Amino acid sequence: VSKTHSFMTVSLIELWERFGYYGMQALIVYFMVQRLGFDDSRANLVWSACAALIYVSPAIGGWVGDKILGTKRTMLLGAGILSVGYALMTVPTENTWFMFSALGVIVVGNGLFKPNAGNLVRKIYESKIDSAFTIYYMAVNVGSTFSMLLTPWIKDYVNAQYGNEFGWHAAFAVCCVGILVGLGNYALMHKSLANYGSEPDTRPVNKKSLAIVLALAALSVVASAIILEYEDVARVFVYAAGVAVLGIFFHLIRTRAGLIAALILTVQTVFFFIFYQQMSTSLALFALRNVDWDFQVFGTHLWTWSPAQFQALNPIWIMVLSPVLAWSYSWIAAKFALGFAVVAIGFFIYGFAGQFAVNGKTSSWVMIWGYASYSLGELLVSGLGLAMIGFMMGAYFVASGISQYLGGVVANFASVPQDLVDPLQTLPVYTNLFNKLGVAAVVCTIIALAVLPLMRRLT
Amino acid sequence: VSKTHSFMTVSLIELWERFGYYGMQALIVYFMVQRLGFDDSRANLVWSACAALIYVSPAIGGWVGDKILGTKRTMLLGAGILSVGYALMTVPTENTWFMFSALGVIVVGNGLFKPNAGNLVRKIYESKIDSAFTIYYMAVNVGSTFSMLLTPWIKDYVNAQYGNEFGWHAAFAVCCVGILVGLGNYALMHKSLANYGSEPDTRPVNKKSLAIVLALAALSVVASAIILEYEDVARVFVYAAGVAVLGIFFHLIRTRAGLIAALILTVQTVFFFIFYQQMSTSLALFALRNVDWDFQVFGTHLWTWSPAQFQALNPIWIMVLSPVLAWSYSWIAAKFALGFAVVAIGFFIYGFAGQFAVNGKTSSWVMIWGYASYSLGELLVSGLGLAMIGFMMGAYFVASGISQYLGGVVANFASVPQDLVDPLQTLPVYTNLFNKLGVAAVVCTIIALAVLPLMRRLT
Amino acid sequence: VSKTHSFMTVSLIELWERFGYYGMQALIVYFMVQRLGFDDSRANLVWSACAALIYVSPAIGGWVGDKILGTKRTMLLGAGILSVGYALMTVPTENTWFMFSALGVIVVGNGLFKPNAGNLVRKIYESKIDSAFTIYYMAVNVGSTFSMLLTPWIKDYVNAQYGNEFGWHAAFAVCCVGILVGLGNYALMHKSLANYGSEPDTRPVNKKSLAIVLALAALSVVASAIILEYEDVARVFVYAAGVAVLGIFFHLIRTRAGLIAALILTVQTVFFFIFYQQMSTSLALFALRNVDWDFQVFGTHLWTWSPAQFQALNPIWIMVLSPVLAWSYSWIAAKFALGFAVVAIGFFIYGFAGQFAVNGKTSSWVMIWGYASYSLGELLVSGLGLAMIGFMMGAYFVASGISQYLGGVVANFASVPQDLVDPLQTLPVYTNLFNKLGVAAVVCTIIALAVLPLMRRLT
Amino acid sequence: VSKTHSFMTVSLIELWERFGYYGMQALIVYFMVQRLGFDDSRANLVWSACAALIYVSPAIGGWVGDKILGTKRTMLLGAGILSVGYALMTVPTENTWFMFSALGVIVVGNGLFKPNAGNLVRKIYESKIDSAFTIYYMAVNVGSTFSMLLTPWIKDYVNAQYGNEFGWHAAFAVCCVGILVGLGNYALMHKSLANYGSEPDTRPVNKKSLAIVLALAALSVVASAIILEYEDVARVFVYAAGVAVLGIFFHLIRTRAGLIAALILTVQTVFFFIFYQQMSTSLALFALRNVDWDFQVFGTHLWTWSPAQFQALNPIWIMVLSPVLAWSYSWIAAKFALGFAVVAIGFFIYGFAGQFAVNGKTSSWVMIWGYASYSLGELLVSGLGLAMIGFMMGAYFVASGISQYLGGVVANFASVPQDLVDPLQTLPVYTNLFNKLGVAAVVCTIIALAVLPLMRRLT
C-alpha cells in the first residue's frame, strides 16, 4: 500500500504552512515594536491575545472539518485564508488596523487548516498513527527551522539593500509564497489523498454551510481584530472566559473523584503556559535589546545573529533532544515537576547571563543554552491535554488559551519604556524578571513534587 | 467506601496540629534567646530536654489511647491541652516559669495527641496503611511549611508595627488559633470517624480513668517544667535513664545472638540524633547571628529571610526529595552509613560557608544546601526504630530521647557569650564546631561501613 | 585444530605490513612539506588523492585474489610490490617523480595485499571470524603504534647525527625492512596456510593472468603517479567519479524504497570522511607548526614529541577505548550522530587550545585529548559500509574515496603560505578552521538526529 | 552450632597479631631512617628485601602447619616467635645487627603464623568460608587501623616526654604486648578450636620434626638477617630467583595453550607490586619530609598528623570502599587494567600536590586522596594469584616477592642524600618520580586494555 505517499503529500503541504506561520511568528513581535510604533507593553498583550486565539482556534476548525464541511476542503479553505493573511501583511503600510486585519485572518486560517491536516493524517493510518505523527511533527520542525532562519535574514538583507520598509513585508511575502508553494504542491499531488476523506467528503459541497462558515469567518476575523486592537476588550473577554472555566470546574465539583486530579493538572498547565509564552515575548525583546548577536566560538567569528532567528533554536533543540529522550527513556504526572525544574534552570540561565558577560548586552550563548532548557521542558510536558480524564476538554483548551494572555501580562513585568535606549539600563529589568520567574518555577517544582501523593492516591 | 473521607478529617486536624507545633518550634529557641534573657548555653539545654520529653511522650499517650481511654477522645484531650499550652505562650510575660509551664503542657499534649491520631489512621485502613500514611505525612509537611514560614514573619511584622512584645506572643496565638481551627474542623466532620474507634471507644467514658489521667497530666506538667527549669535535674534524669538503657542491654546480653546487631543499630541511632538535633539548636543560632538574610539569586533581590523561616526548609526538601528517592530507588542497614555521609557533607557545607562569603555573616544559600543535605540524610535513615528486633522498644525510645539532650550539650561546644555581639568573631566558633562535627560524621560513616560484615553475618 | 597457528602466521605478516605502511604514513605529509619543497596546499591535495587511491584499491585486489589469481600469492605479490615502494622511498633524491612513483607502487601494493590477507583470515575460520578479526585488528593496531612511534624518532635521530637527508630515507628503509621481516616470517611459517587457500590456489599459477596483472599493475602505477602529480587531473577524475556516483544513485532512484535510507547514510559517510581525513592533513601541519612538543605532566619533563608520533595516538586510543565500548555497550544508525557529536567536540578541543595556551604554539595535551575524541568517533561509526543494503557497493566505495580528496581541499582552508614562519600568526588560521569545522560537525549532528524518524520509518 | 565462637577466637588472636605487625610496619622505614643512621637508599632496599621474605614466607609455614606439625601449634609457634621479634625490637640499641636479627625473627614468625590461622579458618567452615573470611579480613583491617594510629603517636609522645630513645622502642613493645594479649586471649578461649584441627593435630607432638623446624627456623633467621644486611647478597638472591621464575615459565612453555595467559597475568602482577610497594617506601619518606602534617578542614585546626599514621589510611579506605564495590558491582581479567588506571590517577594525585600547595611541603589532603586511589586499585586487583591456572604457584609467589624488591629499587629513583634537608629541594625529586610513575601506570593500562583480545581468545 502507498498510504505512505498520501502521507507525504499532506506532510509537504503541512511543512509549507508551518513554514509560512513560523516565518511570521519570529518577526511579529519585533514587527510591532520596531516597524510599528507600539510600545513593548502593548505589543506583548496584542501578540498574547492573538496567541490565545490561534491556540484555541483548531477546536472550532476541527469540528467544522468533519461534521460541517469536508476535512480536505476545510483544510484548503484555511490554507487560502492564510494566503490572504500573509498577503495582507506584505503591503507596506504603517496602519494598525491593517496588521490587525491580517492577524485576525491568520487566526481563522490556522483554525481551519491545522486540525484538519492532522485529522486526515489520522484518517490515512486508521494504530501506527503515532509513527506517522512522529514523521509529521519532524517535517513541521524542519520547515519551521528553515523559515525562522530565513525570513529574519530576508528582513535584515532587504532593509539593508532597499532602505526601510521592504524588509519586513518581503519576509511576510515569503510566508505568503510559502503557502502558495504548498498549495501548488497539493494541486499536483492531491490524487493520493482523494481516496481518504472525511464524512462529508463522500458527498459534494453544501453551499448553505459554505456560505455560513464564510460569513462567520469574516465575522470571526472582525471579532478577532477588535479583541486585539482594544486591550481592555481582551481583558474582559479573558476574564469572562476565566469565570467560565472556573464555572465548569465548580459545576463538575458538585458531582466527583479523580477529576480533582485533572483539576490540579489543569492548574499546573496554566502555570506552564505562563512560562512558555515568555520565551516568545520578553525573551524576544531581551534578545533584541540585550544580547550580543556576534556569535564566536572559542574566539573565532562565525556569524552575527538576527534576534528573531533565535526562535529557530526551539525546533532545532526539539529535533536534537527528542531522540535523546527516546533512548534515555528506554535506558507519572510527576514529569510535570521535571518540566517545572527544567524551565526553572532555563530562567536561571538567563539570570546567569548577567554575571559573566556585561557590556549592556549579555553573550549570545545565553540564547542557545536557554532554548535548550525551554525546549527540553516543553518536550517532556507536551501532550498532557490529550490524556485528560469531552465537556471538560473545552475548559482545558480555554484555560490554556487564557494562560497565553496571562503570560503576556507577566511579560509586562519587564516592559521597557521607549525613552530608555541604554542597554546598560535595560539589562537589569530583564535579568530581574527572569531570575524571579525561575524562583516561581522552582516553587511550581515544589508544588508538583509535594502533591504527587495525591496523584498516586488517584491511581 | 468513603474511608478516604474519614482519612481526610483526621488529616485535616493533624495538619492543623503540626501547624501549631512547628510554628512554635521554629521560634522557641530564638524566643528563649532574644525575648527571654537566657544565654544560649542554657536555651540549648532547656530546649533539648524539652525535645527529649516531646519525643518519648507519644509512647505513654499511645498506650493510654487504646488501653485506658478512647483513641478519639485521648487525641482530642491532647489537642485541648495543646490549646492551653499555646494560649499560655501568648500572654506577654517575661516570666521563666510561665514559658516552662507552657512547655510542660506542650509535652503532655503532644504525647496524648500525636500517637492516637496516627493510631486511628491505622484503624481506618485495617495493608495500604502505607498509602494513607504517605498522604498523612505529606499533609503534615505542607502544614508545617505554612506555619514555619508564617509565624516568624508574624513575629517580625507585629514587632515592627507594634513595638516590642506583641510579635512573639501573636505568633504563639497563631499556633493556638491553629489548634482551634482544627478542633472546629473536627467538631463539624467527626461523623466519618465515629464508626472507626479504639477498644474503649465502643464503651462510654470511664470517669475514674479520666480523673486519673487528668491529675497525672497535671503532675506530668509539673514534672516536665521542673526538669526543664533546673538544668542539673535534667542531667541526673538523663544519666539515670542512660544507666537504665545500659541496664536493659546488658540484662539482655546475658541470654542473645542477633540482638547485638540491634545494639549496634541503637549506638548509631544515638550518634544520628546528636547530628539531627544540632540543626534545631546551634544551626538556628548560627542562622540568627551569622547568616545574611538578604536572599538574592544572581544579583537580584528577592526577599530578606527571618532566621526562623530557615527551618521550613526541612519539610520543603522532604517533599522535594521523597519522590526523588522513590524513583531513584526503583532505577541493608548500610543506608545508615549513607545518612552518616550525607550528614557529614551537610556539616562540611556549613564549614565551606566560611571560605566563600565573609562579612561576619556567611551567605544565605548555606542554609538552603545545608537543610537539603540534612533532610536528605533524615529522609533515608528515618523509620529504623520501627524495624527493631517490646521491652527493648522502650530502651530504643529512651536512648533516642537521651540523645536529643546529648546533642544539646554538643551544641554547647559553640555557645557564644552574650557580651560578644561581633559576628566577625562569632563565625569562627560556629564554623569550627560544624567542621569537626562533619569529621565526626565521617568517622560514623567509617564505623558503619566497616561494621557491615557483622550485619551480613546476622542475616 | 591448530587453525589458530595459521591465523598467527597471517597476523604476523599483516602486523609487519601495517608496520611498514603506517611508519610511512605518519611521515609522508611532513616529508612533502619539510624535505620536499611542496607548499602545504599542494602536499594536502597530493596526499588526499593518494589516500583516495589507497582506500578504493582493495576492491580490485580482493577480486583479483579470489577470481583471477590465488589469494595467498596475490597477497605476496602486493607485499613484494610494497617492498619495492618503500625501497623506492629510501633512495636520497629531491625528485618529485621519484616519490610519486613510490606512492603509485604503494597504491597497487596495498590493493593487492590488504583485502587478500583479510580474505584468507575469513577462509581460515569458514562464524567466529569476528573473534579472529578482533585479534587481527588488535595486531594491526599494536604494529602501527610501534612504527608510528619509531620511524619519526628514527628520522629525528638520524638527521641529528648524520646531517640532512639520511633521516627520512632511513625511516622509509625501516618500512621496507619491516615488509621484508614479515616476508621472511612468512617464508618460514607458510606451512600452516598451505592447507587453506582461494579458489585458484587449488590449481597452479596461470602465467597469462600473471602477465596481465603485472603489466596492468605497472600501468596502474603510472596512472596513479600522474593523478598525483598534476592536481588538475586529480580534480577532473574526482569530478567524473562524483558524477558516476550521482549517476548510480539516480539510476537506482528510478526503481526504490529503503534505498533512500542508504542514500542518506552515504551522504553522512561523505561528511564523516571529510572530518577524519582532516586529522591526517591539517592536524599534522598544526602539530608540526603550532604544538609545543615539550610534554610535561604536572610540571615534570617526560619527553619532547616528534610531530609525526602524534598520529600513533589514533591506534593507542582505539585499543584503550574498544574495550570501554564493549562493556559500556553491555551495561540504530543514530550512532552516526553520536560520532558526529564526538567529532565536533574533538574539533572544539583544538579550538579550546587557543584559549589556555598561547606562545604561538598550543600545549601538547591538545593532541592527546583530540585524538581521543577523533578515535572515539571513528570507533563507533566504522563498519557502516559493510552493512549496506553489490552494484551500490561500488558507489559507496567511490563516494568514500572521493570524500578523502574533498577533505583534502577542506584542509586547504587552513593552508599557510611558506613565507609565514611566525607561529604567533599561524595559530589563528588553524584554530579558526577547527572551530568552524566543529560547528559543521554539530550541524551534521543536528542533521542525523532530525532525520532519525526517516530511519525508523524504514524498519 | 557454635562454630561462630571458634571463629571469634581465631579472629581475636589474628586481630592482635596484625595489630603487632602493622604497628611495626608503619614505623620500620622511619625507624631505619630517623633513629638508625641509614640513608634512605639503603633503608628502601633493606625493607623491600624484608617485604619479599615476609610475603613468600607463608608458603613454607602453611605446608609445615598441615603436613609436618599441627596447624594450631605451628600458628602458636609463629606467634611466640613474633613475640621474640618485637621484644628484640624494644631493647634500646643503635645496633644494625640487632634490628636485622629482629627482622629475621619477624619473617619466620609471620610465615609460621599467618597461613595457619587462615588455614584453620578454612577448617572451621569445611562453602561459606567466604563469609567467614570477609569478617576475618574485617577484623584484620580494624586491628591494623588501631595499631597504625596508635604506635606512631606513642613514638611521638614518649619521645617528647622522655627524650630520645624510648619512643620507638615503646611502640615496638606495644607490638610485643599486643602479641601477648592475643596469646593470653587464646590461652583462655582455646577450647572452641580444640575440636577442629589439622591432620597431625589428631596425634601428639613429634619432637623430631619439632627440633628440625626449630633449628631450621634459627637457620632461617640467620639467612634472612644476612640477606638484609648486605645489599649485594639480596641482589644476587633476587637475580637467581628471577632466573628460576624465568626458568619455570620457559620450561612450561615447551609443552602449552592458556598458560601464556597466566604468563601475561604474572607479568602484570610484577608491574603491580612495583606500584603498591612504593606506597610503603618512597611515599612514607615523602610524607615524612614533604607533607604538612597540619590537617585542617575548611580553615579549622583538627590535629597534626604523624607521618606513619598515614599508612592507616590503607585499611580505612578498604573498609570504606569494599562495601562500595559490592553494591556497585551488583548495580574479565581486564579489571587489572582498571587497577592500573586507578594506580595511575593515584600517582598523578601526588604529582598534582606540587601545583596547589608549595611551601616546601604539600598539603596533607594529598595523603588522603592518594591512599584512597591506591587502596581502591589494591581492592579490585587483589586475589588474582588465587585463581591461577601447583608447580607454577611457586613461580607466581616468587615473582611477586621479587617484585617487592624491584619496587624497592624503583623507590631509589627518589632517594634524597642526607645532606639535603631543604624540603623546597626534596619536593622535586618526589613529585618527579610519582609523575613518571603515573605515566608508567598509564602505560600498563594501555598494555592490559590492548592485550584483552588475547584473554578473550583463551576463554
The ranges assigned to domains in chain B are 1-459
In terms of Cβ atoms closer than 10 Å to its own Cβ (0-12, 13-18, 19+), residue B126 is exposed
On whether the CB atoms of residues A103 and A225 are closer than 8 A, the answer is: yes
Name the DSSP class of C195. Answer: T
Whole-Å CA distances, A264 to A271, A448, C369, D261, D365 = 11, 9, 50, 64, 51
Cα atoms found within 13 Å of the Cα of residue C280, Cβ hemisphere only: 27
Cell numbers representing residue B363 in the block? 551567605
Touch between chain C and chain B (3+ CB pairs, < 8 Å)? no
Residues of C in contact with A298 (CB under 8 A): 348, 351-352, 354-355, 431, 435
On whether the CB atoms of residues B143 and B18 are closer than 8 A, the answer is: yes
Whole-Å CA distances, B443 to A429, B337, B438, D454 = 49, 10, 9, 44
DSSP string for residues in C129-144? HHHHHHHHHHHHHHHH
Continuous segment of H or E residues that includes residue D197:
none
On whether the CB atoms of residues D390 and D237 are closer than 8 A, the answer is: no
Q: Phi and psi of B416, rounded to 5°?
A: -95, 130
On whether the CB atoms of residues A227 and A53 are closer than 8 A, the answer is: yes
Pairing of strands B300-304, B294-297: antiparallel
Continuous segment of H or E residues that includes residue D357:
none
Query: Right CATH number for A1-459 from 1.10.150.120, 1.20.1250.20, 3.10.20.30, 3.40.50.720?
Result: 1.20.1250.20
Name the DSSP class of C416. Answer: P
**Residue of D4, D131, D300 with shortest CB distance to B432:** D300
**In chain C, which residues are last before a break of more than 2.5 Å from C to the next N?**
126, 255, 331, 389
In the numeric block, the cell 534573657 is attached to: B37
Whole-Å CA distances, B453 to A214, D131, D141, D458 = 81, 8, 12, 35
On whether the CB atoms of residues A346 and A377 are closer than 8 A, the answer is: yes
Cα atoms found within 13 Å of the Cα of residue A154, Cβ hemisphere only: 19
Q: Report the alpha-carbon distance of residue B353 to residue B369 in Å, rounded.
A: 11
Q: Using the beta-carbon criterion (under 8 Å), do D446 and C316 form an inter-chain contact?
A: yes
Question: How many other CB atoms are found less than 10 A from the CB of residue B441?
Answer: 25
Q: Phi and psi of C295, rounded to 5°?
A: -100, 110
Q: Report the alpha-carbon distance of residue B96 to residue B37 in Å, rounded.
A: 9
Question: How many other CB atoms are found less than 10 A from the CB of residue B209?
Answer: 14
Residues of C in contact with D432 (CB under 8 A): 300
**Residue of B142, B297, B327 with shortest CB distance to A450:** B142
On whether the CB atoms of residues D231 and D42 are closer than 8 A, the answer is: yes
On whether the CB atoms of residues B229 and B97 are closer than 8 A, the answer is: yes
On whether the CB atoms of residues C22 and C142 are closer than 8 A, the answer is: no
Pairing of strands C294-297, B300-304: unpaired
Continuous segment of H or E residues that includes residue D304:
strand D300-304
Q: Using the beta-carbon criterion (under 8 Å), do B134 and A445 form an inter-chain contact?
A: no
User: Vertex C76, ends C72 and C81: CA angle to 5°?
Assistant: 150
What is the 3-class SS of chain B, one letter each residue? Answer: CCHHHHHHHHHHHHHHHHHHHHHHHHHHHHHHHHHCCCCHHHHHHHHHHHHHHHHHHHHHHHHHHHHHCCHHHHHHHHHHHHHHHHHHHCCCCCCHHHHHHHHHHHHHHHHHHHHHHHHHHHHHCCCCHHHHHHHHHHHHHHHHHHHHHHHHHHHHHHHHHHCCCHHHHHHHHHHHHHHHHHHHHHHHHCCHHHCCCCCHHHCCCCHHHHHHHHHHHHHHHHHHHHHHHCHHHHHHHHHHHHHHHHHHHHHHHCCCCCHHHHHHHHHHHHHHHHHHHHCCCHHHHHHHHCECCEEEECCEEEEECCCCHHHHHHHHHHHHHHHHHHHHHHCCCCHHHHHHHHHHHHHHHHHHHHHHCCCCCECCHHHHHHHHHHHHHHHHCCCHHHHCCCHHHHHHHHHHHHHHHHHHHHHHHHCCCCCCCCHHHHHHHHHHHHHHHHHHHHHHHHHHHHCHHHHHHHC
In the numeric block, the cell 543499630 is attached to: B265
- CA-nearest residue of chain C to A331? C331
On whether the CB atoms of residues B74 and B61 are closer than 8 A, the answer is: yes
C298: alpha, beta or left? (left if phi > 0; alpha if psi -120 to 50) = left
> Within D309-419, where are the H helices?
313-330, 335-356, 365-380, 391-411
Cα atoms found within 13 Å of the Cα of residue B426, Cβ hemisphere only: 22
Q: Is C216 helix (H, G, I), strand (E, B) or coil?
A: helix
In the numeric block, the cell 512547628 is attached to: B22
Q: Using the beta-carbon criterion (under 8 Å), do A457 and B138 form an inter-chain contact?
A: no
Residue C92 CB contacts under 8 Å (≥ 6 apart), including other chains: C165, C166, C169
Experimental approach taken: X-ray
In the numeric block, the cell 593496531 is attached to: C141
Q: Report the alpha-carbon distance of residue A227 to residue A230 in Å, rounded.
A: 6
Continuous segment of H or E residues that includes residue D249:
helix D231-253
User: Vertex A343, ends A340 and A347: CA angle to 5°?
Assistant: 135
Q: Using the beta-carbon criterion (under 8 Å), do C355 and A299 form an inter-chain contact?
A: yes
Q: Is D254 helix (H, G, I), strand (E, B) or coil?
A: coil
What is the 3-class SS of A292-341, one letter each residue? Answer: CCEEEECCEEEEECCCCHHHHHHHHHHHHHHHHHHHHHHCCCCHHHHHHH
Pairing of strands D294-297, B294-297: unpaired
Q: Report the alpha-carbon distance of residue D131 to residue D261 in Å, rounded.
A: 30
Cell numbers representing residue A220 in the block? 470571526
Q: Report the alpha-carbon distance of residue A217 to residue D247 in Å, rounded.
A: 99
Q: Phi and psi of A50, rounded to 5°?
A: -70, -35
Helix-then-strand count for chain C, H and E: 16, 2
Question: How many other CB atoms are found less than 10 A from the CB of residue C356?
Answer: 10
- List the one residue out of A441, A420, A427 whose CA is nearest residue A374: A441
- List the one residue out of B457, A385, D319, A130 whose CA is nearest residue C456: A130
- List the one residue out of A215, A216, A213 whose CA is nearest residue A68: A213
Specify which residues B301 forms β-bridges with: B296
Q: How far apart are the first and last CA of chain B?
A: 41
Whole-Å CA distances, B242 to B397, B401, B404 = 11, 10, 12
**Resolution to 1 decimal, in Å?**
3.9
Specify which residues B303 forms β-bridges with: B295
On whether the CB atoms of residues C310 and C412 are closer than 8 A, the answer is: no
Chain D residues with CB under 8 Å of a chain B CB are: 4, 131, 134-135, 138, 141-142, 297-300, 302, 316, 319-320, 323, 327
Cell numbers representing residue D172 in the block? 615496638
Q: Using the beta-carbon criterion (under 8 Å), do C298 and D355 form an inter-chain contact?
A: yes
In terms of Cβ atoms closer than 10 Å to its own Cβ (0-12, 13-18, 19+), residue B2 is exposed
Q: Is D358 helix (H, G, I), strand (E, B) or coil?
A: coil
Q: Report the alpha-carbon distance of residue D195 to residue D9 in Å, rounded.
A: 13
- Alpha-carbon distance A15 to nearest alpha carbon in chain B (angstroms): 39
Amino acid of residue A106: I
Q: Report the alpha-carbon distance of residue B16 to residue B101 in Å, rounded.
A: 22
Touch between chain C and chain D (3+ CB pairs, < 8 Å)? yes
In the numeric block, the cell 601464556 is attached to: D260
- List the one residue out of C274, C251, C302, C216 whose CA is nearest residue C401: C274
- List the one residue out of D141, D108, D147, D116 whose CA is nearest residue D10: D116
Amino acid of residue C147: S
Q: Considering Cα of A103, then A107, then A110, then A113, what sign does the dihedral take?
A: negative
CB contacts < 8 Å between C and D, how many? 52
On whether the CB atoms of residues C126 and C254 are closer than 8 A, the answer is: no
Residues of C in contact with D456 (CB under 8 A): 131, 134
Q: How far is CA D428 from the centre of its chain?
A: 27
User: Vertex A233, ends A231 and A234: CA angle to 5°?
Assistant: 65
Q: Report the alpha-carbon distance of residue A224 to residue B157 in Å, rounded.
A: 48
- Alpha-carbon distance C329 to nearest alpha carbon in chain A (angstroms): 11
Q: Which of C413, C427, C446, C447 to mutate to test the interface with A (most CBs of A within 10 A)?
A: C446
Q: Report the alpha-carbon distance of residue A231 to residue C444 in Å, rounded.
A: 46
Whole-Å CA distances, B72 to B21, B62, C336 = 20, 11, 67
Residue B128 CB contacts under 8 Å (≥ 6 apart), including other chains: none
DSSP string for residues in A331-383? --TTHHHHHHHHHHHHHHHHHHHHHH--SSSB-SHHHHHHHHHHHHHHHHTTT
